[PDB]
Amino acid sequence: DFLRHYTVSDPRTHPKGYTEYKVTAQFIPEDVKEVVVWKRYSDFRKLHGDLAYTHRNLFRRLEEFPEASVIEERRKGAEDLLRFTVHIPALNNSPQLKEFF
Amino acid sequence: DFLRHYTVSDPRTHPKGYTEYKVTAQFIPEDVKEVVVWKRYSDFRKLHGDLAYTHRNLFRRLEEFPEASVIEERRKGAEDLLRFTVHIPALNNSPQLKEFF
């Protein structure tokens, strides 16, 4: 099953216009099997939306007794988004995260 | 580890005054190892309080992207309280529940 790590880096400009981000999903001992894809911020928005709806899902019972440096911030944002899904079973085993890769 | 079931029954009046309830914790195949104790409604109130504080404990992060028949009702109430703790790891593995028996 390994352990999951994530790194979003290396922003490249596509000939069509939009910038692309390199997404690295590391499966780690100290030897790692890596899975690399390329995504744009729109896909990150979609994933964020799906996860955010998946997230904040709790409580169903009671108790009772009786200078285009914005791509850097986008990079770090997507990175935080991916890293936030590590220690939550609902997000880590989410089908949207698996279809994402 | 077995599977947990609970039955609160057989209300008896203690010579000192207070009524006592028979609490059966069943550890179940179809053959069950039983653990029986006797409790009063005060202990049930204490347990209920500890569990209720233990319960309703969620959310610590963000997301981001940019005719004294009242003893019957008391019996059923305590029974519901015990049965409610089965399918929750935080309540099932609670030390208050283990000290209770």
Swiss-Prot record, chains A, B:
The chain holds residues 8 to 123 of 342 of the full protein. It comes from Homo sapiens. This is Sorting nexin-15. It is found in: Cytoplasm; Membrane; Cytoplasmic vesicle membrane. Coiled coil: none annotated. May be involved in several stages of intracellular trafficking. Overexpression of SNX15 disrupts the normal trafficking of proteins from the plasma membrane to recycling endosomes or the TGN. Residues 1-101 form the PX domain. Homodimer. Interacts with SNX1, SNX2 and SNX4. Widely expressed. The PX domain mediates interaction with membranes enriched in phosphatidylinositol 3-phosphate.
